[PDB]
Design an enzyme around this catalytic site. Structure first.
Site, PDB file in Angstrom:
ATOM      1  N   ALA A 150      -8.994  -8.312  10.842  1.00  0.00           N
ATOM      2  CA  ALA A 150      -7.741  -7.997  10.316  1.00  0.00           C
ATOM      3  C   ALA A 150      -6.892  -9.096   9.857  1.00  0.00           C
ATOM      4  O   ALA A 150      -6.207  -8.976   8.918  1.00  0.00           O
ATOM      5  CB  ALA A 150      -6.679  -7.651  11.595  1.00  0.00           C
ATOM      6  N   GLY A 194       1.484  25.433  -3.238  1.00  0.00           N
ATOM      7  CA  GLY A 194       0.484  25.743  -3.906  1.00  0.00           C
ATOM      8  C   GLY A 194      -0.131  24.805  -4.934  1.00  0.00           C
ATOM      9  O   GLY A 194      -0.174  23.507  -4.397  1.00  0.00           O
TER      10      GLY A 194
END
Lengths: 435, 427
Positions: A336, A124
């Site tokens: 790139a 959680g």
């Protein structure tokens, strides 16, 4: 028993260095103090003997309270987790309490370091608790079940990239998280004549034909001293990109490698957010980087992401302001090249190897647009001319160097030497985070 | 494709003012107006080698940027390119990174709208990626390639690199124009351009889309972003009393209005966007929890960014809960935990972590192990009644401070307008 807050904090802190903020508020967490290898660190582990560990109002308190210590004392903060999420009975008061901690971290995001160190349970809010943090060292017996499975760091080191570090054992998670707070805080200074002793010809760790693959992790070993770093975040994630932190002539440096072993080093969406988060890290903590470029391009063919999911890495380099030196050993192509801490993104300095070609398409063969209306459909018989079989008479350095975007050519024996020299010549810098 | 007219076909009739002589690199940069707002622009020349991006061109977009930022004006891009001049080499390739370099010094400061109309590869497919809103024209295939591959309908689904799909180029210009009328013409809230507007709305699973619409003006359009990508979440700009407003709502339809690896992200950038442009927001809750992707992996690290966005959030952010809201997501969807402004609610809306049926599960552990089977599945529907009150009853989370006050279904707009108003603009 072994899940004792004090027994654990005692394991992280160098013994008699510990303090203690809140009472023995047997609520879920303990927030003690003290140093790590000398340097002081606020912390907080959770009591996994007292009501699951599920984070409650009272327990959250000292937690958050501890934040505003380390935040006021610009000392780092650490959290050895072990929580079954939120205390279901407390109503919202806990939910609220679970939620003030989140924002307690978020305020620290890049002001002090925020290592989390999960030993077992992590669900959680405690599954998001350390998400917001900066480095997650998972303990080999720590799981993750937050269904709203199976559990393990082996699943996050891969696939999800969630867990930054898997530990040999829970006890090493204490030993691991202890250096990350040293490297984040005792980076110290450079040392000119200390890498000189280790000037290995690094080009030796390079394949013959600029066409035969290899693994760059070994190359990395050379640039970094012998003690004892890597300490590379999720190797099993974004496999064409081997990021990792570590020291160099004492001074601590971020290292982002383009590992060609996997996918041919080619970047991609999942390959960016590795780096893209790793750069702003060493940026927002004043750590120099090094870029070891050898990437062909970027890509089944998920366009489901890429363009956006690759813009951010540019944004990582283009907004960054720490001293950052680049080097290309072989490849560096197109959008790139640009994306690997190049001059257009404001690099510190950019280096290269003897055959470190740099083109928007490559060279053998990247001519099929220039020589479009020729090398075509006469037979396919003898493709040795071919196109297939410019390259050698361009690409390399000077082809980009006179243009300036590369700063020098270097003898790889003293590869290490150069970076360190180049890296020691920029000013210390550090930035923020957000908008 | 011709840049000039195409630029005169975006600006206010006037108004276009070339910031240079008209060359042949593949760029045309010119100043002008949109509803009286100083707007700087730039467009790639679709003719000249497919709009390619080269040195003397990128340079001009650069000098556009320097001038946008100089003058504090928004900055639009019109894109009929498709990469970077393959035969200018590193210069061109470096010419582009420069353009990013500008654009990167542009996030969070002046607005930047990309309104693609032609092809886009590489830097051309990447310019948009650094511009806040991405408006993709029909024919404008961001037909990007590696080393259909994606039209506007395609790049609104599974990817969602675009935000507002169009239906014709010129209209896309009507898109991108009105789209600066929201950022640079935010306006100020009007206290009575709110009243004659709030309906008794609550009187209506389901679909949330037509609630947001009633919150904003009856008149002014709901410029929804991203829609088809990350659908269990809804985001999109509009107005309220003339003051521009950001909105994000859970989506009871797909994925059970829950959060997912995509969901949280769509909302995530959307917020960081608004707090970076002074615009206030509205958040209409109805998330019944999270979901993986079966990546239970992504959604955690990827969910974090919802927490951050609100955490780091300094613009106004009023929340409306519609009925159910749960756990991390409840906290996530703009809770007071993350320094929220105010939170209002509606007569029938519960705030809890899982809720009755769940809020009794596994807790009682000795249940489906120590109870008469022929009643277990039915007494599992029993523990919900006492619960609903003692668990999840909102008159709880009133006192507790997390939901400021419950607002009536009629007096809804006025409220989402009032609280946003009486609030500070920064901090």
């Amino acid at each position: 028993d072994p899940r004792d807050p004090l027994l654990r904090l005692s394991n992280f802190f160098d013994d008699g260095s510990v303090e203690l903020l809140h009472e023995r508020d047997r609520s879920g967490v303990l927030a003690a103090a003290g140093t790590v290898n000398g340097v002081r660190t606020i912390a907080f582990c959770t009591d996994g003997t007292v009501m699951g560990g599920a984070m409650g109002v009272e327990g959250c308190t000292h937690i958050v309270n501890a934040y505003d210590t380390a935040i006021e004392d610009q000392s780092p903060i650490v959290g050895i987790w072990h929580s079954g999420g939120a205390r279901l009975a407390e109503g919202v008061r806990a939910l609220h309490a679970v939620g003030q901690v989140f924002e307690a971290m978020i305020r620290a995001s890049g002001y002090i370091p925020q290592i989390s160190v999960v030993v077992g349970f992590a669900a959680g809010g405690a599954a998001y608790g350390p998400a917001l943090t900066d480095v997650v060292v998972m303990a080999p017996e720590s799981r993750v079940f937050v269904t709203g499975s199976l559990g393990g760091p082996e699943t996050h080191h891969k696939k999800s990239g969630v867990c930054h570090i898997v530990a040999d054992d829970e006890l090493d998670a204490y030993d691991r998280g202890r250096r990350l707070v040293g490297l984040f805080c005792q980076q110290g200074h450079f040392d000119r004549s200390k890498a000189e002793a280790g000037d290995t010809d690094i080009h030796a760790l390079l394949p013959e034909s600029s066409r035969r693959a290899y693994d760059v992790r070994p190359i990395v070993t050379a640039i970094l001293d012998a003690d004892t770093p890597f300490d590379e975040f999720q190797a099993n994630w974004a496999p064409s990109m081997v990021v990792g932190l570590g020291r160099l002539s004492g001074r601590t440096v971020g290292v982002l490698a383009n590992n060609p072993l996997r996918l041919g080093g080619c970047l991609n969406s999942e390959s960016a957010e590795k780096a893209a988060r790793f750069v702003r890290l060493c940026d927002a903590f004043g750590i120099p980087l090094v870029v070891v470029v050898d990437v062909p391009g970027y890509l089944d063919q998920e366009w489901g992401g890429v363009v956006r999911r690759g813009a951010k890495l540019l944004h990582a380099f283009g907004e960054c302001t720490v001293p950052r030196v680049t080097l290309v050993t072989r490849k560096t192509y197109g959008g790139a090249y640009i994306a690997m801490n190049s001059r257009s993104l404001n690099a510190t300095k950019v280096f290269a190897w003897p055959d470190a070609e740099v083109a928007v398409m490559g060279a053998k063969a990247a001519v099929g647009i220039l020589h479009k209306k020729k090398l075509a459909a006469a037979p396919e018989h003898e493709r040795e001319a071919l196109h297939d079989q410019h390259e050698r008479i361009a690409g390399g350095v000077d082809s980009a160097l006179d243009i300036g975007v590369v700063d020098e050519k270097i003898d790889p024996a003293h590869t290490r030497s150069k970076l360190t020299e180049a890296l020691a010549q920029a000013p210390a810098r550090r930035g923020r985070h957000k908008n």
